[PDB]
């Protein structure tokens, strides 16, 4: 079946402010692109076709954004068809939403919007589905985590999600934030490795039935709200990748991070120099140190760019 | 006879910026326009020529031009039909080679990077335009010109470079070993170029091809069509001398032979070429 995704273009955390006042926290720019030109890229590498997206707060820059962007010309083999509404207050009301309009018939990528990475989400679709017709709808969503090291830059030392995974069916049997904790409370009813390397990453492939598992339980709001009221009742499994770079940029600090990731090249496929959206603005040369200089730039005399440098 | 030595000063006197072989085509040119025996009336303005200057260049430029004549020839004979197809096609040999420098500008200036340190000989004029229409391009480096003893030639490129803001450099004569380190290429502007793809240049390129291979420096030459000349030496007693001399005891050679193993890549008129890909283009030029 085709794949579709959903990707909710509004971050319902107030976290950008001041900088979310004047323009959305997805269409400011990552390196000299907007995060969700590389979240929507993501998708089109993935092989994503109908990748809805919700927008709710300041819908008009990014709708006037994305139809004078490379995934809204009829070249594109993805379709966006943007749905604008401002009844969503958090991803809860979006994936409502999915709901009493049917928009997805198979299991689909829920994306948050500022995701960015290289993800190639057909190993762990594979094998989302496989383990998705064999047990008769046990498992509802396949999250993706990178295999990461807890002290990374990336890892903001705010999201830091620690999982106990059953280590033969990579079942996630327990999962919390460890935002402010400093020993960590696992129940002993889940008895199965406990991982602390995995960075969040937000690219969960659900399953249609966690739309159906927002309606009638109004309560939630977000997916980790989900995962947590889930995981005590419908079995979230996960896929853990180590070659692919995969995070999104929920607050400043891990935006300096993904950022800095990006310019070196850490997101291959999706290096400034590479173009990925074909704007003739933002074009490219990698010289030799990740110095990357637009077109015409000028650069002046005796001035000296190290390293790093776009 | 004798004016022909005169209108060649001329064209030396209003134009410095045009090259020694360019000038004797257009005064023989000049003299082509006053069946075979003007193909000898031709060859003794070459010796004429020669005989005044002792470049490579002019004895090979004139004589190109003995052929790019006498080649219109072989299709057709005549009287006066073939002075005036003789002299169309020459006109257009002329105009053909005053577009020479720009093309070489335009091949060999991408072959700079930014930030780089080249090196080079006494002074060219091609050399210069390759520069030229390297800070054209927003490229910016730094340049080493030897002084280049007898005639001080690096001190006037230097002082014909220093005008396009470049930071140059006017090291010794004897120092190219000593910065041959500092330079990330050397460009020089070939007087000759030889059969085997070598080069015939003033005093001095020799050395600093020696050194540059010995560190792997690439060497890049900037010469023209015309100055493809068909020699073949073998060491620096083969160069005749003709060229060597423009005339305790001093000997001073003006020119010596870069061996072709040298030297990296030559920049034509007709295309960058390989040392190995002159001697077919000689050929061509040549039957
Ligand atoms: O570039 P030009 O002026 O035609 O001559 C090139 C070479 O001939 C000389 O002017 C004399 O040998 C050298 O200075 C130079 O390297």
């Not at chain 1, 492939?205 to 709200?225: E, G, K, M, W």
């Amino acid at each position: 079946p085709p794949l579709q995704a959903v990707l909710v273009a509004d971050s319902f955390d107030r976290r950008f402010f001041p900088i979310s006042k004047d323009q959305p926290r997805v269409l400011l720019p990552l390196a000299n692109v907007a995060l969700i030109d590389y979240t929507l890229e993501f998708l089109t590498a993935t092989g994503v076709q109908e990748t809805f997206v919700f927008c709710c707060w300041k819908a008009a820059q990014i709708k006037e954004h994305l139809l004078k962007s490379k995934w809204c010309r009829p070249t594109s083999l993805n379709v966006v068809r943007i749905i604008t509404s401002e009844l969503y207050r958090s991803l809860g009301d979006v994936l409502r939403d999915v709901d009493a309009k049917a928009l997805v018939r198979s299991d689909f990528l829920l994306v948050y919007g500022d995701v960015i990475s290289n993800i190639n989400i057909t190993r762990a679709l594979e094998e989302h589905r496989l383990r998705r017709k064999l047990e008769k709808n046990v498992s509802v969503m396949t999250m993706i985590f990178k295999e990461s090291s807890p002290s990374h830059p990336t890892r903001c030392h705010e999201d830091n999600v620690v999982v106990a995974v059953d280590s033969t069916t990579n079942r996630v049997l327990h999962f919390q934030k460890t935002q402010g904790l400093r020993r960590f409370a696992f129940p002993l009813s889940l008895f199965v490795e406990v991982r602390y390397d995995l960075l969040d990453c937000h690219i969960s492939i659900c399953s249609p039935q966690v739309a159906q598992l927002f309606t009638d339980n109004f309560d939630y709001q977000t997916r980790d709200d989900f995962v947590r009221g889930l995981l005590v009742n419908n079995q979230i499994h996960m896929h853990v990748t180590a070659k692919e770079y995969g995070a999104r940029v929920s607050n400043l600090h891990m935006y300096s991070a993904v950022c800095a990731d990006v310019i070196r090249r850490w997101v291959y496929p999706l290096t400034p120099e590479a173009n990925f959206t074909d704007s003739t603005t933002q074009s490219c040369t990698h010289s030799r140190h990740n110095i990357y200089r637009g077109p015409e730039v000028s650069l002046g005399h005796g001035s000296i760019l190290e390293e790093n440098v776009l | 006879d004798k004016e022909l030595i005169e209108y060649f000063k001329s064209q030396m006197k209003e134009d410095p910026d045009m090259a020694s072989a360019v000038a004797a085509i257009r005064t023989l040119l000049e003299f082509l326009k006053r069946i075979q025996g003007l193909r000898a009336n031709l060859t003794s303005a070459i010796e004429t020529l020669c005989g005044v200057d002792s470049s490579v260049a002019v004895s090979s430029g004139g004589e190109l031009f003995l052929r790019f004549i006498s080649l219109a020839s072989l299709e057709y004979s005549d009287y006066s039909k073939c002075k005036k197809i003789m002299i169309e096609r020459g006109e257009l040999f002329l105009r053909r080679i005053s577009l020479s420098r720009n093309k070489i500008a335009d091949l060999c200036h991408t072959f700079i990077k930014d930030g780089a340190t080249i090196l080079t000989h006494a002074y060219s004029r091609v050399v210069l335009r390759v520069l030229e229409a390297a800070v054209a391009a927003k490229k910016r480096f730094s340049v080493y010109v030897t002084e280049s003893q007898p005639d001080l030639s690096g001190k006037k490129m230097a002082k014909a470079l220093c005008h396009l803001n470049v930071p140059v450099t006017v090291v010794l004569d004897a120092a190219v070993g000593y910065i041959m380190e500092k330079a990330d290429l050397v460009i020089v502007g070939a007087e000759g170029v030889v059969e085997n793809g070598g080069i015939i240049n003033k005093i001095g390129t020799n050395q600093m091809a020696v050194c540059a291979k010995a560190q792997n420096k690439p060497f890049y030459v900037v010469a023209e069509s015309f100055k493809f000349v068909r020699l073949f030496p073998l060491n620096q007693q083969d160069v005749p001398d003709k060229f060597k001399y423009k005339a305790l005891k001093e000997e001073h050679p003006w020119v010596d032979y870069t061996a072709p193993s040298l030297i990296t890549l030559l920049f034509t008129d007709l295309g960058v070429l390989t040392p190995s890909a002159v001697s077919d283009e000689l050929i061509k030029l040549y039957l």
